[PDB]
Each structure stands twice: as structure tokens, then as C-alpha cells.
Subunit: 495 residues, 3 copies
């Protein structure tokens, strides 16, 4: 005979959530925060295309391997794409000193302008056209690196070369040259006649006199000789001088470094698509709305933080209890707008009014706890691409263990935070429904019988508007004091 | 006159446990998870012995220093043991280029097969037997590295050598050679006659022409001359060519790399024992049943995770309160099977029945919380052995700071987890005993007086089987409604 | 008519504190733990001054660039200060091999003693005074590095040099020498006459024969020639031998390494002040009383742990609620010594007595939780100074990413701990005031009416000393049993 109940929300949700102590708990509202799909393509970064080297490697492109395409337009890029094992590199076999350190410098570089420092037609005293090879073909012919000039003896003499370029520009200059290492002393004379030659080069900060290491080697790409290349950055206002009496592989073209910034060299086997992203990975681009992904560790752009987990979901509301009577027995499918509320049961009432003011105290402190934990990972470890030669293995592994180390550390930090605050989310829900109960029972005191299912029966009487009397905190015990006590002492001596 | 009490377990345990806020709290059940003893021996890893180099270093073994023993059987190993300062290395003094990079490659290597590429008896045009030294003795005689051939002028001439080996095998080949650096120009001619010689060597990817650096040096192991060694890996189907006019230290034997995998070079001063482990450390092996140890950071095998702590113990049950009456006053030594229960006190009852269904709801969620926190460290940072030469100090310290850095990070992660979930374990125990109380008081309502020690006295009466009426959740208030109220209004007007 | 209330402290505090779920909560007592001011000066470390190189670089000092000052006193230092771009280095242009590895060795070094190994006046067979240059001026004259001797042909001959130094000392010796690289073959003969010369040097472990790389270069500091320097550490009982026929830049002075320990090279643009600290950073010293700072990551000394946060404050007491009646309504400005207490309201009482025994159970477990969380970061990652040449960029970035990585990791660990234990601090306060309430209501049972504001009215009566009866846990219900029940059944049938 006349009731009021404390209860909480329940709905059709089946999304599940974990804590430290429980797995797979059905909750009423949750929020996935792990991105796990990608679009499988290479795309532009916010309107800036990558440089897709195709089957060419970085050396192939910079040296001008005849099978590689130059970028005459001087386009800026957002990153650079190189296949894992590019097929078009040093078509003429050899080595490329500090190649990896250079590939690294590329990673902070967004735009080149190729310029001419020594035109091919200016080597008056030597042969600048016979320097081609079956190893570097072009349309079936013998050709050569398009940016360096293989210099050959003219009419049986190699006059000593001394040429200098003064960097009048304001940008750094990337300059590449090399030296030729023949098979045998016959070939040395056949090509440069001087039996004993050097390639010397000087700047403010660079000092190197290179000599030819004649030796007998197996044939790569048809050649048993070798060409070894060098590089350096000529600073603004500085100058560079090459002196050679032979074997010199001369620069024609240098690269003006005209834009630096966030960039990268991505190893990927994919080609281009009409496509834009904010976050790009080697196997595809990412819809960067979630704060965490597990697609690939080497993502670049404005990206979610990478974590090694199959799932990462935060709890937002109650557990999903149908559930009857008061809150002791579970949730109310019949309460729709609010997480915690009550239920009119008078001689005319229907029920199910929510306590707006502790549900928007709730949806306030959880919506604020959600961003506060995301931002807690703003400074999470983003991994960076880097390469290493076959005698840099210790530092490669070092680099690999430090990037795995942090990925594991932040994977754990994120799993634990979600698990911990998920437990703190559900326990919070258990606290407000119990504290809702307590405000009404510290209101209705003697005047009301508390049933232990989560509901109260009144010894006095209360219409619809005395039910708002107790829902508001506005209830007045003396406004029914005398009535109520007169009506339970009648049960004390009742039936 | 007639009672029932809520209470919890208490026993003879004295194992202690810590939380964030308290130290040294006596608990009823706990679980150590830190392994801190080792067996003090070098053992096999799961049936696969290590390679114990004894007083020999890795170069000593690979070069065949006469005092080192070859491994003619070609045994596979689980790891390699090298004393800290091995005594048998380059018995003939010198250097060993990229030694550390090679020791590193050994760490991913489990089996060699030594093979012959250039037999000593095939150097028809030079002396292959006079090349021995008092620096490399064998049975008191002068001997030499057993795997390289010191080549000497024959009958006063050193014909130019050009020999090539074609790697017809399917495995990688480790090949070692060297060059001799004499004291003075007299000795250069005394041994090789050509005053100006080189050691050239080529592969697909290797190009090096080495020249002798004659200089005056102090005598190591009786010699003031030096031998400098080189190494390289000859790929399957590739070939290698040495050309020398003198000073060449020639390979006889190469190492077929026939098994790669998890391996390591352990620095340890211990010798072998008839002994097997699953986890091996430089100072001894570990009984790998616990998920954490503190024995040594450089453990290899299926190992617990290393942490810098003297202790790591998780709480499993209650605090250990003797403790009297209801739960307000502490635990019941008298309750044996269950963590939470009650106590029959009727006109014939004895007491102490456990609530099976919230104790195996308890021993369920703690046993599940224990493995869930162990596995939370599956991806914990395992450290790796690595070495560095005396001009690689910056990267040595880098490597040392990154491995300490992660050990400190995961030591903290583990101490905090245990401390935090230990507090969440004990607070949980406090929640079920209080919630056990609440189910019975929301059952027995008016019909019962609640004492505040944790017990209830009944205004009606209840036999043994009405005590199971309230222990089951099966109690019926109207089944004693009228009786009980009639019997406290008799106390309202009682004595 | 006659009352007692449960309540808690409230005061004039406005210091604010955050948790996982709330920001900016006003608390009654807190504790800042983040140091964020510095004194802006370079100071001594605990009585040991730094070595302030001023405008000179480390090479400038060690080589004796005429513009640098030697440290004749051989002072020990606590660290070394070098401006970012020092102006006084290789006044004679060139390179300094493994410079960074040497700067690193300095970081574990606290005291040099310069000693003489080859006095300038002992080069009887060559010119030891003409070796000066307009590039290395001193008082406007031409001078030279004060610690090496530029050796010149004597009277048109350069006799081959063979000199050796035997390290009879017990300390390690730092030894520096170099070689001269002329512009052209004329200058080579003009200075050393031998057209083909070397600089050879040997120790137990060092073997290097250096040759001059003549090339045409741009002029630095007026010179287009180059001097290239080398260094090595001569061990106790070992000896070193230089052999040259020219271009040798000879050591005069070596550095006895006489004290090693904690040291560093600090990059700072500041000069010295009459000043001592326990913790020094490049932009100033720190009052090292707090356990965390955010002043600069490269602090040295007994220092707080560096974290990237604008604020780090722990909660110590209650939230700051004026707040009326019992605890339901907030704090009591009127309670001064204790965090939790009560309030005499009898027919003569005043009120406000604190429960000493659960407030010093409180100020005990929070003061113990404060140090326990500080010490939890004893093993926090301290960063270390290190440098890298322009072809060591990959390992520079590696080093930078690993030191940022740990700073981010420990910044997060510390923000989360403070936020988490701040929530555990306030919830604890909410637990004791509610449990204080429960001890008194489990004491005064029937004999007392519980109002729901946090207070109780007595059906019996209780003077001042029956209020200590209930504050002590010493209350006796039968000592007012009969009285109280007789006096609420009078209200049951009352007005
Ligand atoms: C799930 O419940 C919501 C109300 O909470 C309702 O609007 C929606 O249509 C329901 N969906 C299904 C499939 O039942
Ligand atoms: C400790 O208590 C257990 C029962 O919980 C009992 O079986 C065991 O014998 C006791 N041991 C000692 C030494 O008292
Ligand atoms: C703040 O309160 C303390 C007592 O808690 C008092 O001693 C102090 O004088 C007060 N300060 C101000 C500025 O009101």
C-alpha cells in the first residue's frame, strides 16, 4: 500500500568491458577507443603527396640510375616510399658511403631543387661521353648515372683536374661524387693512363683524398669493377674543391635542400591511389578519429597512439542488470532518460522519474574522465623509421629493443588505465544508486518503512506532489509527522 | 536469547603483505611471486649444452689459437660461455676488426660446421710451414693459429697470389683472414721480399685492398709486430677472391652457419656441471616457476621477469584479525572452509557455517585476478647481452641506460600493481563481509534486533532449519511475521 | 533536546588538487612536490667548483689553443662548462678524431695533472720554433697550440724521428698528437723536404701509421691546410712510440687522469657566480628540497626527478566543505585540532571534541603514504649529456628518443600516481567520518534517535561525561537502557 523505489538504468546494450578483476561484463554504455581497420592504400598526407620511388632505391634516384625517373618539377613531399628490396639502385656495382646517415637526413627533408654545378660539356680536357656501361642500360643501350659524369682520358692523357664550386645559394647543398675501382692495372691505364691517381676534395669541414683500390672481384650486373660514392653537405657561403688525376666520378647536379620538417621514409610494397589521409602506415591509411590503433607501429601524420592489443574499450555506464522491484534486484528497462531515478507508486501513480541532478553529475564526471585519460597519453612514444648497414647490427637491435620497449610500456599503461578506470566507473555507479537511496531514507525517517529490496512504504500518505517532495530534497517530515506515527502504532497493535 | 552472526576467516598465517598505504599487514592467505634463489651452476638449456670456451675468447676459438680446442663434432649449442677476461685470445698480438659486431652475430647462431676452403698443402708457390711464433706456443714449441695460414716467401720469392673460393653450399659462410704488420723494413723483406705489398679481397658486396702499416711498437707476448684480422659472410652462390703479393694471412677453414635462433654469449666465471635448467644466468640457474626474479638481469631461456626488489608478495585473503563475537571484532579462528560465513546460536545449535556461494565467488575472482596480473607482464622488457670496444663508449652507455631504464620502469610497474591490487584485495574482503551482513538484515527486518557487534537477535524464533532459511536467501518474513511483532511489543511494555 | 554530531575539519585553505575524475577540488591540507624555480646561475656542487672553459671548447683547452687558459693548478672539478658554440677551438683548422668519444671520457673525469713527456727543447735534429701560424695568434703575434709541437725541417733535412715514452705513472695518460695536411706538393717539401712521409705510433693496443692527404681546400682562419689530431690512453706500465719522417705534430704534454667519478659536460651560456648548490642545470641551480622539478632535463647533482608538468600537488586532508549541523552538510570551521570529531550538545555543553585516535590514525597513514610514493621513484630515469658528430645523426636521434621516452614515461607515472592516490586520499577521508558515525550508532542503539543530518538525539539523557562515554567506545547501553525505552514509548503515545 503505496511505494517508492530507488533504481537504475537498463537497456538493450550488449557491448562488453573488462576490469582488473572481471572480464566480459555487459555494460549499458561503453566507448571503443582502439582503431583496428585501415584502407589498405598509400595516400597523400593532408594534400601533400608522397614521393613514390617505385622499384628505385634512394641512391638510384639521387644518382640518376637511368632506370629511375628524376623529379624535374622539384615537388615537395609528405614522406618518401621505397620498396623493401628496390631493384634499381647502384646499377654499376659498388658502395655508397654513409648511405644510412643520408637516408636519415632525407627523413627531415621535404623538398629538393636539383641544380647544375659542373655541366657535362665543360670538361674540355677529358672525355665526358665514353663513360657508359652495359651495367646501366637505357632503352637497351649502355648508359650511366645521369647526375654524375664518368670522366675518361682524352686522346690518351688525363690532365690533373682542379675544379671548385662556390655555394652562392642560401640553402644547404647535397653533393655526391665517386671514384672508380678497376679490376687490374691494365684497365687502370686503359681508362686514366696515370698508374697512380687520387680523388681529393675539400671544404671548410671536409678533407678527403681518395685512392683507387684495384682488386679482382666477382661480377655484379656484368661488372667486376666497383664504383664507390661519397656525399657531403656544402653550407651556405662555403665552397668545395675536387682535385683528381683520374678515376674521379664527377658531380654534374647537386640538390638544394629547400624545405625541412616532419618527414619519413616508409618501407612499403604498395603503389599510389587517388586518396588522402591524416595518418599513413606501410600497409594503409587510417581514419584517425580514435585515440589508439594497432594497425602498424610505423604510422606517420596526426595519428592515434599505437598499442599491441586486440581490444581497448572503456565503460561509460552501469552493468546491464528482467530486473524487478528496487535496485537490489537489478536495472529498470523502464527508465529511459537518466542513469538513476525512482518510481511513483501511489494510489494513482505510474512511475519511473529520473534524478536529473545526479545523472548529469554522472554523465559530467565520466565524459570528463574520458578525455582526461586520452590526453594522459599525449606524450606517448611514437616510433621512427631508421636503417642500418650489415656492420651496424648491435645498434640496429638496440634501436629495435628501445622501440619495442616503449611500445610494450605504453601498451601496458593503456590496458591498465582502461581496466582500472573501468572498475572505478562501475563502482561509481554502485555508489550513486546507494547514495540516492540514502538521501531519501535520511529524508523519510520514522514516517516510512524500508523494505530491503530498495523501496520504501509510507506510514503517512503522499500524493504525486509529495513524491516530488522527496525527489527534490524538499520533503518535510512534520508536514506528515503526526499522521505517520499515528498510523504505524496502529500496526504495532494491528492485526 | 538466540543469535546469528556475520563473520570471516582467521587462521595461523603470519605471511605479511604491503599496500600503497600500509606495510607489514598480516594476511590469512598470500602468494609469493618473486624467485630469489639460484642453483649457482652453469647448466644445459632444455637438453642443449652450452659451448664453454673456458679460458679462451671467441677470437681464440674461431682463429684456432693453439691453446684453444676446436669443436670437431660441430655441436649445436644453447648459448656460449666466455670468461670475463679470457686468457687465450690473439696469442699473436693485434686487432680483430668489427670483433663486437661478430660476437653479436654469434648471439643469433646455434651451430657451426668448419670446412676447408684452402688446404695448407695447396700453396705450392710459397712457404706454408715456417709461419709459426714463440707467441703462439703448443706443447712448448712455436705454433700458430690453426685456422689461418701465415704465408712466407718461398726460396726468396713471393709470387702474387690470386685464389678464389666459390660458396657452393646453401649456408652462410664465416670467413676470416688477416694481414701482418712488421716492425721494420728489414723484416718486411726478410719475410715477403716485395717491399710494397697488399692484401686485396673481393665479393659481390665486399671490396677491400689492405696495406701493411710498418711501425715500431712495444712487445706483446714477445712480439712487437702485429696481425690484424678481418671477417665477412660469403652468401650462398657468391664467391670470394684474395689477391696478395705478401703479408697475407690466409684462411684455411671457414664456418658454415647451419642453425640460427635464440642464443647468447654469457659472461661467466663458472665451469660446467651435470645439470639442466629452463633459465640460466651468469651466476646460476633458476627454478622457473615464479613469474618474477631478482637474481641477475641477464637471464636467458624461458625465464621469469627480472625486477629490482627484495620482495614481491600478493595478498590472497583477509587480514588475520582472539577475535570475538561478530565481524566488527575480527576473524573467527573457528571457521575453516570458506572465507565468509555465519554461526548458529539457537537453543541447541553450535555454529560456524560458511557462505559457500560468496566465498567461491571470492576465491574465483582473486585466483582470476592473480593470473590476469602476471600475464599483464608477458611483454616485459628482457635484457640482451652486447659488447663494445673502447671507442664505442657513448653507445655502450646508451645501451646500458636503456636497459636500466626499462628494468626500473617494469620494477615500478610491478611493485605498484601488487601494492594496488593488494589494497583492492583487502578492501574487497571488507565489502563481502559487510554485504553478507546486508543480505541477512534486508531479510530479517522487523523480526530481528541488530546488535552492532555484527550479530542479530530474533524477536520471533528460528530453529536450525530457519537458520538455513536465512543463510540461503530463502527466509520468509510472514512465516514468522505475526509471531515476532507480538514478541517485541512485549518488550516495549516489558520489564 | 540534547544532541551529538559526527563532523570533520574545515579551514581557510584554498590550495587545490586534482584526481583522475575531478579537477580543481579545494582541499583542507595539501603538499606541493614540484620544484619550478631556479636561481639562474652557475654554482659549485657541494664545495667543488666547475671548470668554466669560457669561449674555449674542450679541444681548445686540451690542445692549448693560445687563446685558452691552462689549469696549472690541476684543480679537481664537479663538472665542466662549455658554451654552445665556443669560439676558441682548432684555431688552426682541421679535425679531431673521436672527439665525441673523448668529451664522453671527460664526463667520468674529475681531475687532470698535465705532465711533460717530450720537452720542446729536446728535438735536437729538427726545428721546434718556426712552427707557428697567423691562424693561432697570441698578443697579435703568430703562435700555436701550446701543448703540441709543430716540427719543421732543420737546415733543410727532416731526420726520421723515433721517440718513445714509457708511462711510469700509476694513472692513465691522455696523449694527443697530430699530423699536418698541406695544400700542395711544394709546401710539403718547403716544410718537411721528404716528399713521402708518415706518422706512425704504437702501444700495446694502438697501431696506426698516418699519411698526409695533400689537397686543395678553402681557407679557414686564413689557412687552406689542415691539421688532424688523434688521441689515446696509455695504460700504467705501457709505453708509446712515435715514428715519423715528417708532418708529425708532436706531443709535449700529456694529461694524468688522477680522479674519476660522477661528472658531466654542461652546455651553458652562463658564467660563474659566488654560489653553491646541490643541483645544477644549464640555466641555473635548484633548491633541492622537493622530489620533482620541471626546470630542465639535464640536471646534475643530488637532484629532484625531472617531469614535464606545470604542476604536481598531492592531497593531504579533506575537501573544504558555512557548512552546518552534522557531516552530511559539510565541514566544521569550528573544529581545530583533529580531522574527525564530534560536538557536545547537552543542557550545558558547548561542543567540538576531536577523535584523536582516528585522526592520528589518519595523519599517520597519509604522512606514511607520502614518502612511500616519493621513494617509489628513487630509481627514476636521470638523463645524461652526450654529443654526436654530423655523421652520427641516427644514433643522436636514438639517444634523444630514448631520453624523451623515459621522461614521458616517468612524467606519466608520477601524474597518475598523484591523481590516483589523491582520489584514494579523499575517499579515505569520506570513510573515516562515516565509520566514526557507525561506531557511535552501533553504541547508542535503541537509546538514541538518528536524525539523518549526521547527528543523534538521545531518548535517555547524557551529561558531559556520558558524552565521553560514547566518544571513548566506553558507552554502556544498560547504564541507560531502562531510562531510554521508557522515554520514547512516551513519544509513541506522546503529543
Ligand atoms: C535500443 O534501445 C534504444 C533506446 O535505449 C532504442 O532507441 C533502439 O531502437 C533500440 N534498438 C534495438 C535494435 O532494439
Ligand atoms: C595451520 O592451520 C592449518 C589449518 O588452516 C592446519 O592444517 C595446520 O596444521 C596448521 N599448522 C600449524 C603449524 O599450526
Ligand atoms: C588560517 O587558519 C589558521 C588555523 O587553521 C590560522 O592560524 C591562520 O592565522 C589563518 N590565516 C589567515 C590568513 O586567515
Amino acid at each position: 500500500g503505496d511505494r517508492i523505489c530507488i533504481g537504475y538504468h537498463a537497456n538493450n546494450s550488449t557491448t562488453q568491458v573488462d576490469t582488473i578483476m572481471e572480464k566480459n561484463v555487459t555494460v549499458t554504455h561503453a566507448q571503443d577507443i582502439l582503431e583496428k581497420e585501415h584502407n589498405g592504400r598509400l595516400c597523400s598526407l593532408k594534400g601533400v603527396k608522397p614521393l613514390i620511388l617505385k622499384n628505385c632505391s634512394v641512391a638510384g634516384w639521387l644518382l640518376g640510375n637511368p632506370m629511375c625517373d628524376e623529379f624535374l618539377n622539384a615537388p615537395e613531399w609528405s614522406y618518401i616510399v621505397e620498396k623493401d628490396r628496390p631493384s634499381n639502385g647502384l646499377c654499376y656495382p659498388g658502395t655508397f658511403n654513409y648511405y644510412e646517415e643520408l637516408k636519415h637526413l632525407m627523413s627531415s627533408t621535404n623538398q629538393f631543387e636539383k641544380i647544375q654545378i659542373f655541366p657535362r660539356s665543360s670538361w674540355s680536357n677529358h672525355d665526358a661521353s665514353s663513360g657508359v656501361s652495359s651495367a646501366c642500360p637505357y632503352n637497351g643501350r649502355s648508359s650511366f648515372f645521369r647526375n654524375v659524369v664518368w670522366l675518361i682520358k682524352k686522346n690518351n692523357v688525363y690532365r690533373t683536374i682542379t675544379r671548385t664550386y662556390n655555394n652562392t645559394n642560401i640553402e644547404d647543398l647535397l653533393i655526391i661524387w665517386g671514384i672508380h675501382h678497376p679490376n687490374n692495372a691494365a684497365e687502370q691505364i686503359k681508362l686514366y693512363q696515370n698508374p697512380s691517381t687520387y680523388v681529393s676534395v675539400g671544404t671548410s669541414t671536409l678533407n678527403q683524398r681518395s685512392i683507387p683500390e684495384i682488386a679482382t672481384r666477382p661480377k655484379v650486373n656484368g661488372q667486376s669493377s666497383r664504383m664507390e660514392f661519397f656525399w657531403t653537405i656544402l653550407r651556405p657561403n662555403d665552397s668545395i674543391t675536387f682535385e683528381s688525376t683520374g678515376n674521379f666520378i664527377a658531380p654534374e647536379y647537386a640538390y638544394k635542400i629547400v624545405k625541412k620538417g616532419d618527414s619519413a621514409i616508409m618501407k612499403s610494397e604498395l603503389s599510389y591511389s587517388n586518396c588522402d589521409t591524416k595518418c599513413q602506415t606501410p600497409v594503409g591509411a587510417i581514419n584517425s578519429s580514435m585515440p589508439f590503433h594497432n594497425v602498424h607501429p610505423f604510422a606517420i601524420g596526426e595519428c592515434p597512439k599505437y598499442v599491441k592489443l586486440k581490444k581497448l574499450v572503456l565503460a561509460t555506464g552501469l552493468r546491464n542488470i528482467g530486473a524487478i522491484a528496487g535496485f537490489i534486484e537489478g536495472g529498470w528497462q523502464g527508465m529511459v532518460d537518466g542513469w538513476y531515478g525512482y518510481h511513483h507508486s501511489n494510489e494513482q501513480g505510474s512511475g519511473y522519474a529520473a534524478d536529473k541532478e545526479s545523472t548529469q553529475k554522472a554523465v559530467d564526471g565520466i565524459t570528463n574522465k574520458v578525455n582526461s585519460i586520452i590526453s594522459k597519453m599525449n606524450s606517448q612514444f611514437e616510433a621512427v623509421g631508421k636503417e642500418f648497414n650489415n656492420l651496424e647490427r648491435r645498434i640496429e637491435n638496440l634501436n629495435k629493443k628501445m622501440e619495442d620497449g616503449f611500445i610494450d610500456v605504453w601498451t601496458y599503461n593503456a590496458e591498465l588505465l582502461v581496466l582500472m578506470e573501468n572498475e572505478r566507473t562501475l563502482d561509481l555507479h554502485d555508489s550513486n544508486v546507494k547514495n540516492l537511496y540514502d538521501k531519501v531514507r535520511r529524508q523519510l525517517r520514522d514516517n516510512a518503512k524500508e523494505l530491503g529490496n530498495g523501496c520504501f512504504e509510507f506510514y503517512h500518505r503522499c500524493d504525486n506532489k509529495c513524491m516530488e517532495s522527496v525527489r527534490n530534497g524538499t520533503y518535510d517530515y512534520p508536514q506528515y509527522s503526526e499522521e505517520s506515527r499515528l498510523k504505524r502504532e496502529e500496526i504495532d497493535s494491528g492485526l
